[PDB]
Amino acid sequence: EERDIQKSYWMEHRPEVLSLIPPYEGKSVLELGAGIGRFTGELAQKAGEVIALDFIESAIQKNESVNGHYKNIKFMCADVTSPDLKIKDGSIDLIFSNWLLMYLSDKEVELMAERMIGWVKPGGYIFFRESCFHQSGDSKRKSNPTHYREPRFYTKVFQECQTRDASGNSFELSMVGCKCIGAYVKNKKNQNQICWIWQKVSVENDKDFQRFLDNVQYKSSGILRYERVFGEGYVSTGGFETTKEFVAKMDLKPGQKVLDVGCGIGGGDFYMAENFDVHVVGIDLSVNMISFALERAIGLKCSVEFEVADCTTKTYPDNSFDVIYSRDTILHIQDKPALFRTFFKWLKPGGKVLITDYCRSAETPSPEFAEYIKQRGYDLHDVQAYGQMLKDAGFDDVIAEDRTDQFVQVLRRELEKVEKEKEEFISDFSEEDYNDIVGGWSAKLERTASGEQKWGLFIADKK
Numbered sequence: 001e002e003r004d005i006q007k008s009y010w011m012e013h014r015p016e017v018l019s020l021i022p023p024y025e026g027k028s029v030l031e032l033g034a035g036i037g038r039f040t041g042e043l044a045q046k047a048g049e050v051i052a053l054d055f056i057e058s059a060i061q062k063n064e065s066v067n068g069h070y071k072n073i074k075f076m077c078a079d080v081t082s083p084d085l086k087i088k089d090g091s092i093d094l095i096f097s098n099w100l101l102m103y104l105s106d107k108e109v110e111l112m113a114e115r116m117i118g119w120v121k122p123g124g125y126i127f128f129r130e131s132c133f134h135q136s137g138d139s140k141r142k143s144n145p146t147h148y149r150e151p152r153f154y155t156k157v158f159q160e161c162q163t164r165d166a167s168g169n170s171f172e173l174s175m176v177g178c179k180c181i182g183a184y185v186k187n188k189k190n191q192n193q194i195c196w197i198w199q200k201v202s203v204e205n206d207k208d209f210q211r212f213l214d215n216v217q218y219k220s221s222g223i224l225r226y227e228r229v230f231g232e233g234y235v236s237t238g239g240f241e242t243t244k245e246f247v248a249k250m251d252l253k254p255g256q257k258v259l260d261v262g263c264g265i266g267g268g269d270f271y272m273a274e275n276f277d278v279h280v281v282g283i284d285l286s287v288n289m290i291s292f293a294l295e296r297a298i299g300l301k302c303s304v305e306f307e308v309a310d311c312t313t314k315t316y317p318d319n320s321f322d323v324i325y326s327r328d329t330i331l332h333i334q335d336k337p338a339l340f341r342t343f344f345k346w347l348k349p350g351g352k353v354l355i356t357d358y359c360r361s362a363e364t365p366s367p368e369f370a371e372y373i374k375q376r377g378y379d380l381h382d383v384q385a386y387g388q389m390l391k392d393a394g395f396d397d398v399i400a401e402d403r404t405d406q407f408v409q410v411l412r413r414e415l416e417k418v419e420k421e422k423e424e425f426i427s428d429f430s431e432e433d434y435n436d437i438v439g440g441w442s443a444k445l446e447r448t449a450s451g452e453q454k455w456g457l458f459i460a461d462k463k
């Protein structure tokens, strides 16, 4: 039994947290797992009345020895899960705990959310703080029964919690805050102390609809494994480092307008807009790509806009853009000359096009390369011929560079990093995700080594 294991464990065995908890001056507070009263004394000094509870007799007795002089505390030795624990429903302004749910089974956490919402009055708060993430228990002794859960579990249990009064008003919990104890630092290892603040609200939601919405988002998230390999914000060759190199060639001036054809999740667009004070118009055929772009754009003050659109059918007025930019997108486009003629009209006189794209050697594709091209739906040309297409469309000063050596260098570095981080990659993602990346990068390196696959950089300008 969980109860016996946790009780046995516990038988053998601050200003920041208080600053985080909802206002408690004058209020009715229930402290669960009070221990010897590290918080109890502080709470009581401002609270109207406190109930301090712990299932270890000696702990709660020590609490009473130290804090008993505060006459507004009632002390209880009880297990929070016990049916015999009697606390008047709707009587509590604030339920406070600090390390507690980690000592309950998964089903008991669900039980406790229900007990807690019952105990708190409408408009009241629940605060809890737990040690999270499985790896937090790697160095744990076999007889340490502490549950180090993924934070998503606590969020989901409490967001689905529902109850009724008599008769028969529905109540749920809204999430007021989720906070990292000691302040969140990006990429910082071992930040596992997390707290939540929930408020009891009058509402009846359909949890199946919420699960549906979350599941739609989860299904759309495959692109994140590619972002992991390329770099935050990027889903093509070389991430930020290649983007910085190529954007420099545009000579972007403040106030210019850039079209990004195949904008993906927007990282290159944020980079251009923020660093060069240009307006970027980004289009991508994928709803899911644009969803991430829009989300990462929230809060940014740079001038970017994103739309789901097919670049082969989208229309813009003549002379709309100073620059048309595209990275590893146009291999999907079957009629490049038509696309380029459209680019020529969209660009203002004096404008510029910059494209990187997958290409092939001039030689006829091997049967294996041809089948790959067909399955993927690609339209590949040699670098010189691609350049000629830009010339044919009316562009001047066409530069067409074979950058395959750079492509290979970048592929090798991208693959090596994933391989060296295999365990974490798999924990964050999955084994199948890891295999997809390693397999795909290995195959690209095979096709480059055979001499069949190429990578090109194209720059041209208009009149």
Ligand SMILES: Nc1ncnc2c1ncn2[C@@H]1O[C@H](CSCC[C@H](N)C(=O)O)[C@@H](O)[C@H]1O
Residues within 6 Å of the ligand: 006, 010, 032, 033, 034, 035, 036, 037, 038, 039, 053, 054, 055, 056, 059, 078, 079, 080, 081, 097, 098, 099, 100, 103
């Ligand atoms: N099911 C349960 N019912 C009541 N108390 C419990 C419990 N499971 C664990 N506890 C108590 O929860 C406390 C956790 S340690 C933290 C104590 C205090 N909240 C503070 O932060 O200082 C322990 O004292 C333990 O005895």
Ligand SMILES: Nc1ncnc2c1ncn2[C@@H]1O[C@H](CSCC[C@H](N)C(=O)O)[C@@H](O)[C@H]1O
Residues within 6 Å of the ligand: 233, 234, 235, 236, 237, 261, 262, 263, 264, 265, 266, 268, 283, 284, 285, 286, 289, 309, 310, 311, 312, 326, 327, 328, 329, 332, 333
């Ligand atoms: N006809 C089309 N119109 C617009 N985008 C297209 C398209 N065909 C393919 N794409 C998009 O082209 C993108 C290529 S991946 C690269 C995205 C981004 N430029 C970056 O470098 O990170 C994909 O997101 C894909 O959805």
